[PDB]
């Protein structure tokens, strides 16, 4: 039946995107109820970017220093505050499209959908994972600040990311919806670089289970392994150490395929040591680590091929 890196339908989120301008800077904002959220760096000027003092720069502005536009309608800002690295703009109107939602701080290794926006207008949607080094490999251009990352459960949108900047390696950094950065990054244009990253072991294992659920067992073997013996091989290939908690999480998938977690680890250990041998898994020539065990169960069918 196939396996794709699919994102959540973006509708509920599109109806919350607005444009926010201050000075000569324009970026996207998130409009929920009667509040608009956006990167606080929107109040910076070319010279302020290197070493800005936001509390100082902010006190120097008023409600009308901010221009908030929803579609082709201007929104009147009647208050403002700073929450960590975000600005909280109160508007005279409550967003009619506000969906049931909540703010969540995603954890490393987890995935979410990003709705790339420009000038308050949604341009695209794609899935990505929060890297262990706290960055994401997105696709953002100037003007994308304010674009958000999210997950959806039933009809509740869990916002978990707002975009703020790009690092030298072409990767991206941002904050949760409370304005707290993911990683040791700060909103200042002083030299910063992503730390060394690692492969998300739990996800690679989840992805292998998905492959089995979809029909092939070519990579499996007759061996098994000690959690400890696996981790020695993990360090060598720069994979995150596997823990008992990770083993526990893979429980349901293990049950649906009848393949013991440690046996799959043995299978992975072999793939890392011998390679793909010119063969593919779910269409890939490399081991994918951007699918959580949750993403697999969500997408795949509850019945394995066999
Ligand atoms: C959202 O509009 C943007 C998005 C960037 C632009 C290109 N792709 C993106 O995702 N906002 C920015 O342009 C930010 C804005 C500043 C953030 C801090 C507070 C003041 C405004 N800048 C970046 O995202 C720049 N990143 C960065 O400076 O990082 C620290 C640093 C400084 C010097 C050397 C290494 C690292 C980007 C434009 O610059 C580089 C591509 C050189 C990293």
Curated annotation (Swiss-Prot):
Q: Which reaction does it catalyse?
A: TSAVLQ-|-SGFRK-NH2 and SGVTFQ-|-GKFKK the two peptides corresponding to the two self-cleavage sites of the SARS 3C-like proteinase are the two most reactive peptide substrates. The enzyme exhibits a strong preference for substrates containing Gln at P1 position and Leu at P2 position
List, for all copies, the residue spans of the domain called Peptidase C30. 1-306
Record's signal peptide: none
Cytoplasmic-side positions: 1-306
Q: Where in the cell is it found?
A: Host cytoplasm; Host Golgi apparatus
Q: Which domain of life is it from?
A: Viruses
- Residues at the catalytic site: 41, 145
Give the protein's function: Cleaves the C-terminus of replicase polyprotein at 11 sites. Recognizes substrates containing the core sequence [ILMVF]-Q-|-[SGACN]. May cleave human NLRP1 in lung epithelial cells, thereby activating the NLRP1 inflammasome pathway. Also able to bind an ADP-ribose-1''-phosphate (ADRP). May cleave host ATP6V1G1 thereby modifying host vacuoles intracellular pH.
Subunit field text: Monomer. Homodimer. Only the homodimer shows catalytic activity.
What is the designated name of this protein?
3C-like proteinase nsp5
Q: What gene is this protein a product of?
A: rep
**Which part of the entire sequence is included in the shown chain?**
3241 to 3546 of 7073
